[PDB]
Design a binder for this molecule. Sequence first.
Ligand SMILES: NC(=O)C1=CN([C@@H]2O[C@H](COP(=O)(O)OP(=O)(O)OC[C@H]3O[C@@H](n4cnc5c(N)ncnc54)[C@H](OP(=O)(O)O)[C@@H]3O)[C@@H](O)[C@H]2O)C=CC1
Ligand SMILES: NC(=O)C1=CN([C@@H]2O[C@H](COP(=O)(O)OP(=O)(O)OC[C@H]3O[C@@H](n4cnc5c(N)ncnc54)[C@H](OP(=O)(O)O)[C@@H]3O)[C@@H](O)[C@H]2O)C=CC1
Ligand SMILES: COc1ccc(OC)c(CNc2ccc3nc(N)nc(N)c3c2Cl)c1
Ligand SMILES: COc1ccc(OC)c(CNc2ccc3nc(N)nc(N)c3c2Cl)c1
Ligand SMILES: O=c1ccn([C@H]2C[C@H](O)[C@@H](COP(=O)(O)O)O2)c(=O)[nH]1
Ligand SMILES: O=c1ccn([C@H]2C[C@H](O)[C@@H](COP(=O)(O)O)O2)c(=O)[nH]1
Lengths: 545, 542
Amino acid sequence: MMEQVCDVFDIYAICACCKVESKNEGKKNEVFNNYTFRGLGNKGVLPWKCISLDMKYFRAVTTYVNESKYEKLKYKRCKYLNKETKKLQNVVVMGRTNWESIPKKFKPLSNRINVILSRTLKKEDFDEDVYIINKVEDLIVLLGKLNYYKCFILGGSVVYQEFLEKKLIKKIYFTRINSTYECDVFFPEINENEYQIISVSDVYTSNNTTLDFIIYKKTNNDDEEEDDFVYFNFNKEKEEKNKNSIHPNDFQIYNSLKYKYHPEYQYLNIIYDIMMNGNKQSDRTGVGVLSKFGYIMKFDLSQYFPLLTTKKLFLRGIIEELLWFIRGETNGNTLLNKNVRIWEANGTREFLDNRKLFHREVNDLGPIYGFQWRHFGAEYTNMYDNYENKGVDQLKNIINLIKNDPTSRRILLCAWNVKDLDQMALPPCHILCQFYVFDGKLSCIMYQRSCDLGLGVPFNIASYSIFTHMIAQVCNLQPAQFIHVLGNAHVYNNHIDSLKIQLNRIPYPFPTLKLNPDIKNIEDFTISDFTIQNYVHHEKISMDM
Amino acid sequence: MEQVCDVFDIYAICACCKVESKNEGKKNEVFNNYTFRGLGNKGVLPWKCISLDMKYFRAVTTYVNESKYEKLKYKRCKYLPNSKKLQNVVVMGRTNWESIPKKFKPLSNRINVILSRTLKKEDFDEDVYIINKVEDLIVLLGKLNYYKCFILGGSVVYQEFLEKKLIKKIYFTRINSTYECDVFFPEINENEYQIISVSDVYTSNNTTLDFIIYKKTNNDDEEEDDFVYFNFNKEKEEKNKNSIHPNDFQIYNSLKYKYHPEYQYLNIIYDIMMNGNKQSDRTGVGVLSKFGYIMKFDLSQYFPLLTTKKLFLRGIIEELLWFIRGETNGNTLLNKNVRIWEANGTREFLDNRKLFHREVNDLGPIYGFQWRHFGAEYTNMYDNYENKGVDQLKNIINLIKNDPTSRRILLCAWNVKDLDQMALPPCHILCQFYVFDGKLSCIMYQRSCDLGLGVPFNIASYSIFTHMIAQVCNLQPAQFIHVLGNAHVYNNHIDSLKIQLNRIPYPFPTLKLNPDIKNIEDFTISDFTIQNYVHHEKISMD
Ligand SMILES: NC(=O)C1=CN([C@@H]2O[C@H](COP(=O)(O)OP(=O)(O)OC[C@H]3O[C@@H](n4cnc5c(N)ncnc54)[C@H](OP(=O)(O)O)[C@@H]3O)[C@@H](O)[C@H]2O)C=CC1
Ligand SMILES: NC(=O)C1=CN([C@@H]2O[C@H](COP(=O)(O)OP(=O)(O)OC[C@H]3O[C@@H](n4cnc5c(N)ncnc54)[C@H](OP(=O)(O)O)[C@@H]3O)[C@@H](O)[C@H]2O)C=CC1
Ligand SMILES: COc1ccc(OC)c(CNc2ccc3nc(N)nc(N)c3c2Cl)c1
Ligand SMILES: COc1ccc(OC)c(CNc2ccc3nc(N)nc(N)c3c2Cl)c1
Ligand SMILES: O=c1ccn([C@H]2C[C@H](O)[C@@H](COP(=O)(O)O)O2)c(=O)[nH]1
Ligand SMILES: O=c1ccn([C@H]2C[C@H](O)[C@@H](COP(=O)(O)O)O2)c(=O)[nH]1
């Protein structure tokens, strides 16, 4: 009915939060909620030294104005005050402490109307072109007399709190710094019943830390080439002809989001597309699946490590497997003895017998990945044989091509050995890896013939990202893009419920990957040379239930 | 100041097909936008029925956006109760009116109007208006409540409405098939009207077609700023890359909507020219390259034979039949005058590959061999490999017929053990097939792609191959998915591609296979026919 202050005057809040230094309740499996990011400052200044990307975003946002949109805002505000009818600027409001924490050479903030809240100080105490007020109410009166686009609360713990309590914030531009720092001041705890995240930005790395930008929003407790657009969609099928019996509320949150730019959405959007338009098919098992054919995902390893955050994932296993491949092993016992059971089910007497591998020893997986990577072509005997210098050593070959013929368009690693397929516990899901080198950067494409979106893919994305880092390092290059190509992409029916829950979880800024820098050979890597940092994630999910 | 067509929104909507050359003039045919002009024949439409165009016709003429009518009203009277429903005015010639079935008459949800000098208002409804001449229309439009005015016209109506510069936009449907006609839509003056949009290509009632738009040449709010914010770190541009001038792509960038499938190919080229990386190559020519692209063609709606330049197919079909037989002898192709593999079989090239003991044109264990004898020991192109190695081609055909849901239906030409013995490693790594509801789809991964010369043929080769497999499996072709690894453009092709990107695609042709061929091994060069292939003139990339 009657407009609210924050809407007429367009008062927004903008901030940057990191992870507080809670000693620990045990870094041993800690819960993560949005409240995880709340570190505002320490000892009167910022907890972190410098994060230029946040500064850049901060300046970009608080200074942008759209001239052509002001006229409409003028009417809004005047009409509200019952009032009939320099370059346009935004207004920034900051508490005294916050103001004093900013280096002289930056004050007053350029191209913005600075406003300062304070009691202890008055106009006489400032030499700068700045407005002083001692009552939040005073700011409202002021906005009514100024010509401005939008009003941002640059904050201060105190300032943020009262503005949220007085419910004067329309939106919260929140920067999530994904690293921990000592802090003495914190951002208020946002009430999800008052505010809900509506947009999540891409993830980036700046000054040794990943970070992203999300937007909280207050919740209710030419024109011709536009008609032509409508025309071209004249054949788009109607509604109630989508493909499956998926309910609306099933993805309430997921669809509430305006901008889903976080990389994890490349994966999540595929899960969604399959659930909405997938094809009903039976499979090698009997569970049945929803499937689509042909997808592609790209991850910028230079800005982050794509370890899904909408659910917990462990990497010790997939790393041991990767190391296991590199060694050219095919002995399933080697993994089991490290308590990794990725290949256990495919090495049992039963499994092997079903594959007509009657004379194969339990856990003797046959000429799979490892063997094909180091000995493609060699006649396979048993997992205990010495295959030294037999078969093509593909791994060695691609690492040499990356080093001495980087522009080669023949740097491929193929595990699909048509001749040995049958002798394998099962044909490889990851067919090949093609490498690309430019300006000292390594990118990698991996084609997957079969993809289990629910359980497999999340691990696959991680595996080949780590492998890219590995190949890149021993080749003296920086990892670039990991492009994942899916062939038969399917979601198992007994997974549909967990994934519905997953698509309604908002992603956290990705973590990072650190390899021991001393390892100069693809072969000398060991489990302790790998370290995942700042992995903020949602609660673990059991797909099968 | 003001121009009538801008105030009253007078548009033209039509559908034209191709007209018989009338057996006169037998040379190598040339095409142009005027190729599509057939309007009608014997008071009726040149064709039996094309429901899709019908659906487009109705949808366009009946569409109305009431929330935008006010602005129009403002503009109209500022120039100059009774309809709970705002509608559009459709002006049609007498003949055209008569030719319309009675059951549909007084075009539902459209303020009907007729041009005639014989029809007397009396014998007509109060609704169905009628006029004495062109100029009289403007008057009725000023005294009415309508959204937009569409000229369903007739050859005469169209002609005049154009000479009198009254048309703003033309919604032209391009019917890609030939019929006999007696009346034809006037030739559009490129200096006055130009295409700004091209739609996706479709197949309706046994013919392909697309929708294009001609434009008269002139010669909420909060998540909006949020969008801008999210671009704060946008490549901080304003610095040209790869030295590619603005106007080099005037026509290409002038288009608003490019939904034609061909743009999937054209856009990749554009992307490589604007952002490709400069690299040297095993040829010393240099290229611009990017890594990882994907294209998708709905084989059920058209055959993706590029139209922005002429492409011949006899060669690539022979190469395909050559693969299916499992041959590795380049002489077979050269004797049919298909020189696709000629350079790869010369003494020099073979010697450069360190294949000093290989006969000229003996390409080694390439595609053919790998498809029917993977794993067999390659000796020479004349040896008998009958039943040696794995016959993958046969296995996937069986997998498609007896285990359609299998996720192991792949044909792989990249045999790591035999790579060095090949005149050269396969560019087309593999093919994966997918089956659902009696439809067949194919994904082909290409490790190296010469966007300028090779990709165009590549797209066609595997599209045809998908058709071939589907048929011998009693399935209908669906999608052909092309995954590009290293995608590059040769520097000496750039100027040619600059010319190409500025050409506007024609609706795609169609591929017809001899229905009698029931086994992959039984196809012959005559079992393939490309129909209705309208294309631009040839271009020599070099
Ligand atoms: N990471 C981020 O994005 C941000 C971090 N910060 C950090 O926060 C810390 C500062 O926060 P904090 O200590 O809470 O200080 P604030 O910046 O909130 O300043 C509090 C002071 O502002 C004044 N004030 C607040 N409300 C009113 C009012 N209604 N009327 C009159 N005066 C008012 C008073 O000044 P007086 O004493 O004169 O009466 C008050 O003591 C710093 O370390 C700074 O670096 C700040 C902004 C953003
Ligand atoms: N493919 C397509 O999109 C279309 C195809 N067609 C086809 O075209 C053929 C009909 O075309 P065509 O012969 O041009 O017929 P039209 O439908 O244009 O009708 C022409 C008649 O309209 C009247 N007329 C024309 N100009 C004027 C004017 N200035 N003032 C008053 N009346 C005027 C005359 O009627 P009068 O005799 O009373 O003076 C005239 O003979 C048919 O076969 C039809 O199927 C028609 C429309 C679209
Ligand atoms: C030019 O402005 C400055 C220069 C240096 C600074 O460090 C002490 C500061 C501190 N303020 C500062 C720094 C970063 C910020 N980042 C965000 N996302 N939001 C803020 N609201 C904000 C603020 Cl207030 C500002
Ligand atoms: C329901 O309306 C109709 C049913 C059948 C018709 O032709 C016999 C017609 C009239 N002819 C007709 C048919 C198709 C058309 N299609 C387009 N893109 N533009 C036209 N201007 C047009 C026209 Cl005039 C209308
Ligand atoms: O790293 C892996 C390993 C396996 N799978 C899945 C794919 C299939 O769901 C199943 C193997 O069945 P086939 O595709 O081979 O039929 O395992 C993955 O998604 N990722
Ligand atoms: O059907 C074909 C055959 C070849 N090529 C191109 C790709 C490369 O430009 C060149 C092969 O050289 P390498 O990439 O292998 O170096 O031939 C195509 O684009 N399409």
